[PDB]
Amino acid sequence: MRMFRITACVPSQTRIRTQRELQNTYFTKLVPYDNWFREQQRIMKMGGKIVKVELATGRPGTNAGLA
Amino acid sequence: MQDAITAVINSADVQGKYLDGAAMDKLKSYFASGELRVRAASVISANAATIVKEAVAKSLLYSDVTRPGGNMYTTRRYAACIRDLDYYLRYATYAMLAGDASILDERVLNGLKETYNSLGVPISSTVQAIQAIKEVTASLVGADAGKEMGVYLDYICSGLS
Amino acid sequence: MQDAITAVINSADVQGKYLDGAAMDKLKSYFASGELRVRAASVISANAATIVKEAVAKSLLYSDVTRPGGNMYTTRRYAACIRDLDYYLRYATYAMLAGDASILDERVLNGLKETYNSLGVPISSTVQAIQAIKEVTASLVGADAGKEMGVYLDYICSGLS
Amino acid sequence: MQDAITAVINSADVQGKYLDGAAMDKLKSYFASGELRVRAASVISANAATIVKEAVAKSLLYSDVTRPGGNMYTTRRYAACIRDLDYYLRYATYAMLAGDASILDERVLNGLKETYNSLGVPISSTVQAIQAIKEVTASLVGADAGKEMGVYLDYICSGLS
Amino acid sequence: MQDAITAVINSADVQGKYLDGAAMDKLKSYFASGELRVRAASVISANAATIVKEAVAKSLLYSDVTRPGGNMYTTRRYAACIRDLDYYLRYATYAMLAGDASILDERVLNGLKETYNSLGVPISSTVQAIQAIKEVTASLVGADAGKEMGVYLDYICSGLS
Amino acid sequence: MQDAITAVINSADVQGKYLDGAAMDKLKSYFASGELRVRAASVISANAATIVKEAVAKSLLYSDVTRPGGNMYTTRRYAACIRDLDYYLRYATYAMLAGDASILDERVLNGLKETYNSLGVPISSTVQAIQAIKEVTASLVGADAGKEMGVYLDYICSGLS
Amino acid sequence: SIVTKSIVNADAEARYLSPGELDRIKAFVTGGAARLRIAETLTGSRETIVKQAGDRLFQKRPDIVSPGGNAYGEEMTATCLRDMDYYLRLVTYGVVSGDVTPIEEIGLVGVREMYRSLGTPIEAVAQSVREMKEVASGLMSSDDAAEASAYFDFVIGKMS
Amino acid sequence: SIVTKSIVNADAEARYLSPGELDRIKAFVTGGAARLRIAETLTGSRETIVKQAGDRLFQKRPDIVSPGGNAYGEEMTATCLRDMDYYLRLVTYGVVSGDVTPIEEIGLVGVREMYRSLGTPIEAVAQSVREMKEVASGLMSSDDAAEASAYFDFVIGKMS
Amino acid sequence: SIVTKSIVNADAEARYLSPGELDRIKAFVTGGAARLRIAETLTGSRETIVKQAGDRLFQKRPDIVSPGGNAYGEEMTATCLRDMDYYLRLVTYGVVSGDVTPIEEIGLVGVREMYRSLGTPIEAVAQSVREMKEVASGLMSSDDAAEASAYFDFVIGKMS
Amino acid sequence: SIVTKSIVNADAEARYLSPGELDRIKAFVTGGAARLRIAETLTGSRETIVKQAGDRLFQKRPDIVSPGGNAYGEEMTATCLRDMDYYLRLVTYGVVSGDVTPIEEIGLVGVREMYRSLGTPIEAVAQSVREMKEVASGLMSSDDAAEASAYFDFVIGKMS
Amino acid sequence: WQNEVRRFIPQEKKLTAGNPMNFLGMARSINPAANTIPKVSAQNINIEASVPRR
Amino acid sequence: WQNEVRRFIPQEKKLTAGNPMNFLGMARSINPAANTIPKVSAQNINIEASVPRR
Numbered sequence A: 001m002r003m004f005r006i007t008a009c010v011p012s013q014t015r016i017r018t019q020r021e022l023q024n025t026y027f028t029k030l031v032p033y034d035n036w037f038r039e040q041q042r043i044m045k046m047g048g049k050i051v052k053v054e055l056a057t058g059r060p061g062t063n064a065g066l067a
Numbered sequence B, C, D, E, F: 001m002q003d004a005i006t007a008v009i010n011s012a013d014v015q016g017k018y019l020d021g022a023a024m025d026k027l028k029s030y031f032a033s034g035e036l037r038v039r040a041a042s043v044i045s046a047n048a049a050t051i052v053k054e055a056v057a058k059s060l061l062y063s064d065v066t067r068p069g070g071n072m073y074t075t076r077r078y079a080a081c082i083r084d085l086d087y088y089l090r091y092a093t094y095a096m097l098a099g100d101a102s103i104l105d106e107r108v109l110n111g112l113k114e115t116y117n118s119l120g121v122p123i124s125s126t127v128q129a130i131q132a133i134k135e136v137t138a139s140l141v142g143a144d145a146g147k148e149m150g151v152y153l154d155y156i157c158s159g160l161s
Numbered sequence G, H, I, J: 001s002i003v004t005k006s007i008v009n010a011d012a013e014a015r016y017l018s019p020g021e022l023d024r025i026k027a028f029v030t031g032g033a034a035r036l037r038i039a040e041t042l043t044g045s046r047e048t049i050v051k052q053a054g055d056r057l058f059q060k061r062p063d064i065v066s067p068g069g070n071a072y073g074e075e076m077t078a079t080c081l082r083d084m085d086y087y088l089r090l091v092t093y094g095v096v097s098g099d100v101t102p103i104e105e106i107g108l109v110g111v112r113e114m115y116r117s118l119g120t121p122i123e124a125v126a127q128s129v130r131e132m133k134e135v136a137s138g139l140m141s142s143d144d145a146a147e148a149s150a151y152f153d154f155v156i157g158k159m160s
Numbered sequence K, L: 001w002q003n004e005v006r007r008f009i010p011q012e013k014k015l016t017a018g019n020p021m022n023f024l025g026m027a028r029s030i031n032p033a034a035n036t037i038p039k040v041s042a043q044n045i046n047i048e049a050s051v052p053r054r
């Protein structure tokens, strides 16, 4: 469904958490296409930086046949 | 309440014309029903206690409902259930004479579910009682009158459940 | 309503059996408590005006509700308040004689919440009033009879809360 | 929510016309009051811990709820009651700055009585805590500025009763 | 939910038997209904918004509901009104394709009356808007599919009113 | 949720006093029973599925509830019933570990009566299935540990009745 | 229950319990040992009282057991003895409670309507509980026979 | 039914039915008569098809009827044939409905939990209904055998 | 394609295709030659379709091409008829696909926001594709015009 | 190991490995001689107990050694004894670890899907572990057998 | 090698107090004496004086 | 000349759909070939090469 494989670093700007938080601080995850705009916006609201993002799933420039 | 004849009269009157051909053949259907309905009412009013008697004997008697613990237990509750089934049979006979279930959903079903939930009356056991009345009426009045009586009794079942 | 021995009888009746040894043991427990219940009922019936007098003096007087515009104002409402606490103490005496709190949620708590909501009655002020009755009766009659009276009075409080 | 000025706008929009002279007079009355409302809101926001501190001290300490087993016992519940009174004072300040008691039944009193009834929170103790709040606030910001605080804290009392 | 075919499958399955001729006749009846419902749903899905906009233009436009004071004036709640009518036309087409009104009282009529009572939505005006949808649909698709859509929209009206 | 130890702690907390000798020897009774409860926990956790298997075999197999029309008919309803017995056995093991029925009060019996009434679940057959679980675990884990498991399963039965 | 009856009367008169009702409750609460002894006597002799009274009833009225009768077969006779056990249990409940209110609430309101619906001769049910009273008074001590016969008397009077 | 699965899909996707989907309920209602023929021939020949299927299972897997087995007994073979007839009922309901929805809604959801509560081999009951498929292809006409055996392929693939 | 819709549904429910869905694929690969013939007729006679549909669209709604409008001028009518050719080619793509998902993912996702940024009345484009299906049914065979009007019908529904 | 489990439980709620588990670690490292004695006893007598356990397993369920069964052939029976030896070695690994997590990590996650794919009766595998538990309890000395019984009962409970 | 095969009937439902099956054996032990068939034909009876009169 | 006694017991029960009573007779007519008890010693199988070794 033309998913993105992204990786990003999201720090905690307001709380000093005592549990382990690599898994939601620096993480690699698969995000779908229609969710990726909202997800990238949400990272940039939270203050994290998108380290890298590539199109692991699907083919760029496909006019049709993406569902 | 209303029957089928006043139903088509009111349906003509609400749009404000006289009796048209749909009213004509609806009245012809009701008059053709006619004799069968009045004969079924005559035989039900004849053996009125018989259907409720062996209906309770077929469905309710000798079970955990009429054993201690159940809701048919104690004589006051037994007489109340006999009264309820006489109510249901009388009002089903009235709806059978009418040709419409207006007396059913306008004299019986409103408030009945919530008052039975307040009294703890078993809805499924009342449904099986109504099915027993349906079977004994089908055995006593015939086939066509029996099945339209069954339509009115399981309308009571569908409203109550 | 239901007292302790009728509760034993109905508990045997729902399972259909007779009264066995444990039923007779509960009956003898109630028969042992009956002396205390009778003497506490006689004391409360003798002094019943003084209890509600002391309770209203301890918990209701010289407050915002009896300052003008409140619900304890307008002497008709004060007399209705004294009548209400007299009703609470009398039905608590009934439940103390009974040994079961069925009269409390049959003939008192039935609709009492929405009665007080429709009349604008302060619920926790009433709860404080019945608690005032609770330590007045506890100081009046003793620790064990006062304990039983406290059980039924804060049953009234929990139903009213 | 709504304030006095949007109440004027909504009352204009219900009848469907523009703002007439009486609407302008009500708006100018609000603009005249707004300086006093802003000054009182600044004073209450500056001293808001002291109002709830002195109010709990004069109405809630050394009581049956504060003794163990009561609702004011268990420091978690104690600080939750403090936070509740902070919420009441802050939303009353919102209502005094607004000029309409719509924020109370849109953001405070919506389900609050059901919350306290399910939570076992003493209604009259909360009401007398609100009375202590409005007495301390009226002593702090004066009689004329404390009049509106009395309006909205008594509106909280009337909604919660 | 359940359609006509699944309805007769469950009516066989409650006794646990295979399908007999009393299932065969009504099952072939639903197959005979068939293509009519298919093409009716096709043309409704063609001009899907168009029945809605003629229905509002014929019934709800230029009246007291779109005038201020009425519960359809302002763009947000008129948006909610046309979203509701899109929902009703879509789910009536759903019931027409299914051949049973189970989707209506499973997906539409559950809690709709009480949430409209909470929102102050005009029940009679919504019923009249559904009548407008019915008459535009009957003028569009014909007589038999028109009265199929009519009986499902009248089921919606009877449940909502 | 609370076990016997924290139930003692919370009762003494509401009493506002320290642990008297009743608290101490109730705690000693729990400390005596703890080894028995751990051994019964190990046995039931080993034989969790087989207890339900033999209980449903000796209670409600080849009966009318497993017949079509019965509520254990269809694989969905059958597996839901098996998961229900698994829930009852696991929560009875939890209550047997705790020495208190608060987990059954708040996590099992809360809403279960009206849930089963909405679903049409046969209460008496469910109760005798729990009785079959009681007999199987009494034959399996011993007499005294089986007696505590039996009184907790009978608490589930009385809550469901 | 006598406590329930006195509470009902005091609630109807809107007053506390009178000293007469209160020391009647005292007298009952002291003397209940004899009444529970009567109840244990009836519970121990449950089967033989019903058996002998059923035999005596079918001797006195053989047309409830004849063809055309209400209780014809052996199963119908078992239902007759089941009703006898029901009313013996109610008499035991009344002896224990000290008042006829449980008997009224369970098995005497609408009994005429129930036996009208069942076709059962209620005068023969009155004869049945009369013979149960006779057998119980035969195998019971005389003061205890009078104490149980008060409640048996009430059941006979409300059936007939 | 195919209409109820398509309409649940459209209801979830917040749209009207796609014209391809209306074309396929159109195809189903035009071709429905052969499905009724399948249903009536299976209802006519239910006992012999289940006879041959059970007999060939008992030939192929003797461990099922071996001592110690779940289906060892005469009783146990009878309730195995009960399950056989239940799945035959589900296949008739499915070929009437035009979809896999009644089979999954009645006899496939939770069936692994049921059969592991009972200890029965799910691969063996899948082999049983596969044998129902092969004897149905032997007994019934070839063109409708495609649809009937295909729904059988569904239930053996979903069950195994 | 319809195989793409069926394979998306089957992957969503996480097993192989139900025989209802293989029936979908089977009837599609029987009717694909007819669908290709219909699309070839529309491709061959495409020019009269767009030209006559645009002319009768201008006859029905002259406000669109009135001066100051979006479509006023020979340049703007050329761009509008290019849009007409785009939509007609997309409906032929839907015909050869067997579903409406290429129609959605090329021209129906974001079309409302597209024409709102362009200032184009989507109700006028809906009338335009109504005249498209009218001219196509006029010069196409009736059974062929049934499915052609079904796919144009989806275009009208999603874009109106 | 029990140290690993205590570390995991402390890390889950971010503790510093409280004395309430550190005394258990102390008791484990002091009393490890008894569990090493248990392990060397099981390792020395590993073949006798697995042969007797297979004997009682085939006594209770001779389906698998019947010609239709899964363990038929004397090679699949050898595979049965090999898998039971695997589970015995897992039990020894657990009794030297102190908890259930090595048996969980090696042989209980996905064992249901494994034996579903292999077609074996997992309830009969659980019965084999039950018989191995009983033979090991007979061979071992009372409280040592009760100590190993926790690990065995874990294997049966997660197997069934 | 013995095998435990169950039955088509379930476990028997435990007989309770209100069910008259527990009194069937006591009704048999009574064995109540029925009445003989009465040989009256009622055609020979005459309703003018056989009705009593006091 | 009899009164039909009110046989409340569900004796002579019509064997409805779903019972194994409807398949007991066909189980008799099938008469399945129950396999013999195999003689496997399970004591002399050396599990080093009898296990498949492919």
Ligand SMILES: *[C@@H](C)[C@H]1/C(=C/c2[nH]c(/C=C3N=C(/C=C4\NC(=O)C(CC)=C4C)C(C)=C\3CCC(=O)O)c(CCC(=O)O)c2C)NC(=O)[C@@H]1C
Residues within 6 Å of the ligand: C061, C062, C063, C066, C067, C072, C073, C074, C075, C078
């Ligand atoms: C001297 C004049 C007499 C007297 C008076 C007395 N009264 C009280 C106490 C109360 N009186 C009231 C009265 C009213 N409530 C109403 O709603 C109205 C009409 C508008 C009236 C008149 C109330 C409510 C009280 C209770 C206390 C309160 O103020 O709320 C007292 C005090 C009794 C005490 O011990 O607290 C007295 C002394 N007493 C006499 O002896 C003179 C005859």
Ligand SMILES: *[C@@H](C)[C@H]1/C(=C/c2[nH]c(/C=C3N=C(/C=C4\NC(=O)C(CC)=C4C)C(C)=C\3CCC(=O)O)c(CCC(=O)O)c2C)NC(=O)[C@@H]1C
Residues within 6 Å of the ligand: D061, D062, D066, D067, D072, D073, D074, D075, D078
């Ligand atoms: C000397 C030790 C310090 C000190 C104490 C102090 N505390 C209070 C008042 C209160 N303390 C509590 C405490 C609790 N509520 C709970 O639910 C629990 C957990 C069991 C605790 C510990 C409460 C409720 C009060 C309110 C009054 C009451 O008596 O209940 C005071 C009195 C303050 C006043 O002005 O009334 C004092 C003096 N003060 C110090 O300076 C020392 C550091």
Ligand SMILES: *[C@@H](C)[C@H]1/C(=C/c2[nH]c(/C=C3N=C(/C=C4\NC(=O)C(CC)=C4C)C(C)=C\3CCC(=O)O)c(CCC(=O)O)c2C)NC(=O)[C@@H]1C
Residues within 6 Å of the ligand: F061, F062, F063, F066, F072, F073, F074, F075, F078, H057, H064, H070, H071, H072, H076, H077, H079, H080, H081, H082, H083, H086, H087, H106, H107, H118, H120, H121, H122, H124, H125, H128, K006
């Ligand atoms: C022979 C190939 C098979 C066999 C079967 C077998 N079945 C049972 C018992 C039961 N089967 C069911 C199944 C259903 N209930 C339903 O409602 C439906 C349709 C939706 C089905 C298919 C159930 C509930 C039972 C339990 C009792 C009952 O018959 O209702 C047994 C008996 C197990 C026992 O311990 O008694 C057997 C042996 N054996 C096999 O190996 C094949 C799977």
Ligand SMILES: *[C@H](C)[C@H]1/C(=C/c2[nH]c(/C=C3N=C(/C=C4\NC(=O)C(CC)=C4C)C(C)=C\3CCC(=O)O)c(CCC(=O)O)c2C)NC(=O)[C@@H]1C
Residues within 6 Å of the ligand: A010, A011, A012, A013, A016, A017, A019, A020, A021, A022, A025
């Ligand atoms: C301290 C030696 C020097 C340093 C530290 C510093 N750390 C952070 C914040 C983070 N630290 C971590 C590391 C971990 N998170 C875990 O969960 C674990 C294991 C359990 C480790 C080892 C992470 C992920 C963060 C970011 C998220 C967070 O704040 O928790 C910061 C803040 C960076 C920021 O810009 O917010 C700093 C500065 N820097 C120094 O100068 C010290 C010498």
Ligand SMILES: *[C@H](C)[C@H]1/C(=C/c2[nH]c(/C=C3N=C(/C=C4\NC(=O)C(CC)=C4C)C(C)=C\3CCC(=O)O)c(CCC(=O)O)c2C)NC(=O)[C@@H]1C
Residues within 6 Å of the ligand: E060, E061, E062, E063, E066, E067, E073, E074, E075, E078
């Ligand atoms: C005029 C600048 C342009 C325009 C206007 C136009 N409007 C309508 C009709 C309606 N407009 C509304 C919208 C509103 N409802 C409200 O409550 C408010 C303010 C809070 C607005 C703005 C509604 C509901 C209607 C329908 C009539 C009614 O009162 O319900 C029309 C008529 C369309 C018709 O078919 O009747 C028109 C023409 N259109 C233009 O082209 C001008 C650029």
Ligand SMILES: *[C@H](C)[C@H]1/C(=C/c2[nH]c(/C=C3N=C(/C=C4\NC(=O)C(CC)=C4C)C(C)=C\3CCC(=O)O)c(CCC(=O)O)c2C)NC(=O)[C@@H]1C
Residues within 6 Å of the ligand: E060, E065, E070, E071, E072, E077, E078, E080, E081, E082, E083, E084, E085, E087, E088, E107, E108, E109, E112, E115, E119, E121, E122, E125, E126, E129
């Ligand atoms: C329009 C026909 C008339 C009308 C309606 C009206 N509706 C709302 C808002 C809501 N309507 C619903 C109801 C539904 N939820 C569903 O899921 C379905 C179909 C299954 C229905 C029918 C709900 C939940 C709302 C609230 C959420 C929302 O706005 O979408 C309003 C707005 C109320 C408000 O002002 O807050 C109105 C006015 N009223 C009329 O006068 C028209 C005749």
Ligand SMILES: *[C@H](C)[C@H]1/C(=C/c2[nH]c(/C=C3N=C(/C=C4\NC(=O)C(CC)=C4C)C(C)=C\3CCC(=O)O)c(CCC(=O)O)c2C)NC(=O)[C@@H]1C
Residues within 6 Å of the ligand: F060, F065, F070, F071, F072, F076, F077, F078, F080, F081, F082, F084, F085, F087, F107, F108, F112, F115, F119, F121, F122, F125, F126, F129
């Ligand atoms: C089995 C003894 C009898 C019975 C069972 C039955 N149960 C359901 C479904 C539900 N069971 C519950 C119960 C609980 N859920 C919880 O979370 C807890 C406590 C932790 C309990 C006790 C609930 C909520 C349901 C509904 C949710 C669901 O769908 O599973 C069913 C299914 C009803 C249906 O319509 O599918 C059945 C049949 N019924 C019997 O006849 C057995 C005797």
Ligand SMILES: *[C@H](C)[C@H]1/C(=C/c2[nH]c(/C=C3N=C(/C=C4\NC(=O)C(CC)=C4C)C(C)=C\3CCC(=O)O)c(CCC(=O)O)c2C)NC(=O)[C@@H]1C
Residues within 6 Å of the ligand: B057, B061, B062, B063, B066, B067, B072, B073, B074, B075, B078, G064, G069, G070, G071, G072, G076, G077, G079, G080, G081, G083, G084, G086, G087, G106, G107, G118, G120, G121, G122, G124, G125, G128, K020, L006
């Ligand atoms: C025997 C001396 C007489 C008589 C008996 C007879 N009784 C029945 C049937 C029933 N009797 C009852 C009675 C009660 N239900 C209650 O709750 C109570 C109070 C605790 C009583 C007394 C009921 C309910 C029945 C119906 C069957 C049932 O057990 O539920 C019959 C059977 C009639 C039939 O048609 O089946 C008979 C014959 N008949 C006589 O002739 C004697 C006078």
